[PDB]
Structure formats: structure tokens, C-alpha cells
Design a protein around this ligand. Structure first.
Ligand SMILES: *C(=N)[C@H](C[C@@H]1CCNC1=O)NC(=O)[C@@H]1[C@@H]2[C@H](CN1C(=O)[C@@H](NC(=O)C(F)(F)F)C(C)(C)C)C2(C)C
Ligand SMILES: CC(C)(C)[C@H](NC(=O)C(F)(F)F)C(=O)N1C[C@H]2[C@@H]([C@H]1C(=O)N[C@H](C=N)C[C@@H]1CCNC1=O)C2(C)C
Lengths: 302, 302
């Protein structure tokens, strides 16, 4: 038993990380087959950041303006194209450590593992959620760009995130691996803010189910509520509305514990209304929303 | 910016996870060069969990009673020895994926990543601390045993933890990689309980320095303390005594912030009195004690 913020094992993705140099700019690339994916802002100088002309700055580049460094082995760029906000560099060498993979775009509320990298070298692995405001609360310093978000399904790596920037609130913004931004953000050093976030309610109900599965039961009450009446208490506390989608999705945890979603919703209502009376749930003083229903079933089943 | 409970990249340890079967018992082994390290309780039946005689159980065992599986490949056990509470199986094949490694025994307050494993397969990676009471707050199910804890310095994996048992408070006990238990615990299903846990004070201090590095000062005050006055107050919150050794270790974080350790001690003392008054520090409403001074310098300074 026990319940941790658990990351996916990172080995398949560590075998894919390279250093991409364009001029003085170094960041990370994902090397899959004979293509290296990286943020297009690698080609930007200091200047070329308030108003980058990407189409224009790209055409002024040769293949040999890009040094791609695969540990200590230098990869020769034999092609270059931009897809939205990712640069795709065709390399003379295919990655022998390429996993079973697809590119996937996630929803707000869905979780992933980040492999934080610097100069092509994996640094740390952590679990994140896509905030409803389409930011992630990562841990990213200078030269973290080209760090990727992933899920594993069996032996298949699902790449869902590439890291691009930090917003003034210390939160992070990026794209899928096709270079489409999550959220209303642009890859220019200009004034950008995170929108006001809300709490991923389905994830909190799923986290209370995890608490119950670990014999942490104190928050359980007698009230049954309606879906509407819980979504009215919820919207006052900046919680996401909970939809039948979200209720049917808690099925396996309601079955596992025998506790009906609406009985659990009546608990979280009471918790929203009061607080935790100097008690914790699974050793947190806050209502956690960065564990999906699949995360709780996954962890608890092994 | 940002601050995450962050684990080492798991690939170098994922390269080492095997399945060890005995009769009906399957658990995890650590495959390094031509030896598999696993829990000696793999040789236990249903009966023998209470007062196992390990020397008498093992003498009855041949090399060929030990089924070691690396992915598909079954390894050939050509030797067995007992070292404390670990079983060592000499196999006919050196692991080609053996990373640079050492075995280290850690102290309470030290942090490590766990690769959670079932049947030699990886579940997940998470960050843990050796609690003052020689337990860890893990996430471990049936057949979790042999799952290991580790740190990585550059390219070297230092193995520090092997999983053996869950105590009745839902916390975890294990050995070093020489099979010496952390704490007073034994590999028997005898009545055992962890002693009352204390907060790792040097870690909470290190984490407050991390919050200041990240731009947060709200919790500081114009007061200082003596080390002794600090220890009289903190010992009333079930905080570990802070030593001069702990003061010395916080020295780099002090230099970086320009806040003397005893001034930050004064800060913690007031936080213990007042709590957070609806505020959070690095997204927590509790005082976080599972980041070392070293972990903070690692994530906030690189
Ligand atoms: C990645 N390699 C870096 C810095 C990382 C990202 C997360 N934390 C970091 O410190 N990314 C960048 O330098 C990007 C890059 C230009 C500016 N930029 C930013 O992250 C800046 N932020 C913004 O301009 C904002 F707020 F709008 F997002 C910066 C002020 C340097 C943090 C480009 C092309 C967006
Ligand atoms: C919890 C249980 C009551 C079963 C027991 N605990 C106590 O006997 C104690 F309370 F005394 F410690 C206990 O863990 N074990 C009994 C037996 C080994 C260990 C065990 O079964 N290990 C499992 C590995 N195959 C993983 C476990 C179960 C879920 N989470 C874990 O970590 C040994 C100590 C020899």
C-alpha cells in the first residue's frame, strides 16, 4: 500500500535525447528514427525573440547551421523543415534506441511524465497535469527547452508535450510534438500570462478514492448530493464542472471501493465547505487534482 | 522556475530488473554483472513467514530451484549465497546493461528514487526519504519485494534500498544492498510497528531556502534564534534536533540567499506557531521534509 506521485519509467525516452545547437542557442531534441524534433526558437538570436520571423530566419539557414550532438557522437543534418513551432532536422543516422511511439495531443486534466533535460542529458523525471488554463507546473531552468512530456502504454511511448517557455507566474508552456501550442500562447519573448486556473474536480474525486483504497476514510460523510448541486458548490470554489463523462470514468474506483461517485461528491462538498480540521488525506493539506482515475487504478493494481 | 518532487532517470536501473521465482513465490531481483540480488524471503512458503529459519530453508535448495527470467530469457543460476537478508544468485551471463554502480548505506533524512517493479517489470518511479524512524513512505503492493532505491551522480547508480515489507501504519521497511535492514525491523511476519515519526528539520530548512531562491519571502521575520532555543521549540512539534553538521550543510543555500541559517530557523519557528494562514510554499500547505539541501541545489541551481 501507500500512494505516491508516480512517474512513468523514463528509460525508453532517455535513449532519445540529443543536444541541438544553432549558433549560440543550445537546447534539447527528441531523436526518433532519422529526425530530431526541437523548438523552432532554437534558430532565434537574442534580438529575434520579441518579433521572430521564423519562415524568414529558417530560409537563411543551411543544414550545417544545426549541430545535433547524440551524447559524444555528432549527427549530420541532411534536411530541415518547420511544422508549426517544432523544427524537424533530418539526420544522416537513425536512432538505434527508437521506441514504439506515437505523437498524441492531451486534454486539460490529463497527466504525464516530464524528463527534464539540459544539453541533451536527462536530469530528472516528474509527473505533471495539463492545467485547465493549458499550462503545466514544471521545474525548468535555462536550456530545458526540448524537454518532453510522455505516457507509456504497454511498450508504446505516447509523446504529448514539448517545453517552450516560462510564464511570469513560474508556470510552463509548450506544444504537442506536432508543434501546436497548448493554450493561447506564442513562442515570442513578449508579454504573456497564464489565465486563471481551476481545480480538476474528477481528479480530486479519484484522489479521495485513492485515500479510501489506503484506509484513509475520515472525510467520508452521510449526504448524497445531485450532480447539479455539487457543480454549483464547485463553480463557487473555481472547481471544473463534473460531467457524466467524469462520473462514468470514476466507475472502476466506485466499484473497487463500493462508494458511489455522488456519495464521494457529497464528501468533497463537505471538504470544500469546511476544510480538513488539521487532518490530512494521504499526507496532503490540500485537495490534490493531479491524479487521474486511470492513475489511481494503475498505481493501486501495480 | 518551479519545484517538483523529482526522481532520477530510471533507465540505468530498468536495465537491471529481473524476475526471481521459487516454488510459487515470484519477486524482483537486481541483476548486476553475474549476480542477482533479491530478498532472501523468496525461499519462504505460506507457513514459514512467522519464524523462518533461513539457513535451514536455503540448504534444502539447489541452484536449479531458482528460476531467474530477464524479459523472455531465463538466466542459469550456477551459485547461491546468503548475505544477511539478501540472497545472491551467481548467473552464467553478465548483464550487458550493467551501469557504473556502487552500494551505499544511507542515513535518515537522505532521499532516493524508487523504481516500483512487479515480476521484473517497471510500474513507476517516485522520490522517497529515509525517515528518522528508519521507514520510507513508499507505494508497494503484493510481489513488490526486490524493487530498489537509488541515486545517480553523473553516470554512477548508487543502490541504497531493497524492499522487504510494509508495517501496519502503511509505511515501508527494507535493507541496504548488503541485506542489512534499515532500523530495528526483521524479515518475519512477527508483530512490528514503526516508532513515532519525526520531521526532518534540515530538509524543511533546505526547502524554505528553495522557496526563497524561487522568489518567495512572505514567511521570513526580523528575528534570529540560538540553536538551543530552536531545538527546545522544534522538539515540541516532533521535529528532529538540528545539529551544527545540519547548520554547516545549509551554508551554500545561506550564501545564495544571504539569510543566515539561524535567521531561517527563526522563520521555521514562527511557521510552526502560525502555519500558513491560507498561503502555500512551493505549492504546499504543509512544511515539506523530503528534499535535502543537496536536492534543492540540484533542482534550483541546475
Ligand atoms: C528554454 N530553453 C527557455 C527558458 C526556460 C523555459 C522554462 N523556464 C525557463 O527558464 N525558454 C525561453 O527562453 C523562452 C523562449 C523565448 C523567451 N522564453 C521564455 O521562456 C521567456 N518567457 C516569456 O517570454 C513568456 F512569459 F511570455 F512566456 C523568459 C522571460 C525567458 C522566461 C521564447 C522563444 C518564448
Ligand atoms: C504487509 C504484510 C502483513 C504482508 C507483511 N508485513 C509484516 O509482516 C509486518 F507488519 F510485520 F511488517 C509484509 O510486508 N511481509 C511479510 C513477509 C514479507 C513482506 C511481504 O509480504 N512483502 C511483499 C513482497 N512480496 C510486499 C508487501 C505487501 C504489501 N506491501 C508490501 O510492502 C516478509 C516480512 C518476510
Amino acid at each position: 500500500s501507500g500512494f505516491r506521485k508516480m512517474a512513468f519509467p523514463s528509460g525508453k525516452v532517455e535513449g532519445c535525447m540529443v543536444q541541438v545547437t544553432c549558433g549560440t542557442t543550445t537546447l534539447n531534441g527528441l531523436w526518433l528514427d532519422d529526425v530530431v524534433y526541437c523548438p523552432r526558437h532554437v534558430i532565434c538570436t537574442s534580438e529575434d525573440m520579441l518579433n521572430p520571423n521564423y519562415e524568414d530566419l529558417l530560409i537563411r539557414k543551411s543544414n550545417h547551421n544545426f549541430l545535433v550532438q547524440a551524447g559524444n557522437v555528432q549527427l549530420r543534418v541532411i534536411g530541415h523543415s518547420m511544422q508549426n513551432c517544432v523544427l524537424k532536422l533530418k539526420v544522416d543516422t537513425a536512432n538505434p534506441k527508437t521506441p514504439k511511439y506515437k505523437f498524441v495531443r492531451i486534454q486539460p486534466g490529463q497527466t504525464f511524465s516530464v524528463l527534464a533535460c539540459y544539453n541533451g542529458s536527462p536530469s530528472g523525471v516528474y509527473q505533471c497535469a495539463m492545467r485547465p488554463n493549458f499550462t503545466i507546473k514544471g521545474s525548468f531552468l535555462n536550456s530545458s527547452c526540448g524537454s518532453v512530456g510522455f505516457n507509456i502504454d504497454y511498450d508504446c511511448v505516447s509523446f504529448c508535450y514539448m517545453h517552450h517557455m516560462e510564464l511570469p507566474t513560474g508556470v510552463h508552456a509548450g506544444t504537442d510534438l506536432e508543434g501546436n501550442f497548448y493554450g493561447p500562447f506564442v513562442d515570442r519573448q513578449t508579454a504573456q500570462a497564464a489565465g486563471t486556473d481551476t481545480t480538476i474536480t474528477v481528479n480530486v474525486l479519484a484522489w479521495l478514492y485513492a485515500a479510501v483504497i489506503n484506509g484513509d476514510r475520515w472525510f467520508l460523510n452521510r449526504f448524497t448530493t445531485t450532480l447539479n448541486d455539487f457543480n454549483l458548490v464547485a463553480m463557487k470554489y473555481n472547481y471544473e464542472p463534473l460531467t457524466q463523462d467524469h462520473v462514468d470514468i470514476l466507475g472502476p474506483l466506485s466499484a473497487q471501493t463500493g462508494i458511489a461517485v455522488l456519495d464521494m461528491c457529497a464528501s468533497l462538498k463537505e471538504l470544500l465547505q469546511n476544510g480538513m480540521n488539521g487532518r490530512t488525506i494521504l499526507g496532503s493539506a490540500l485537495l490534490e487534482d493531479e491524479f487521474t482515475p486511470f492513475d489511481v487504478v494503475r498505481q493501486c493494481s501495480g
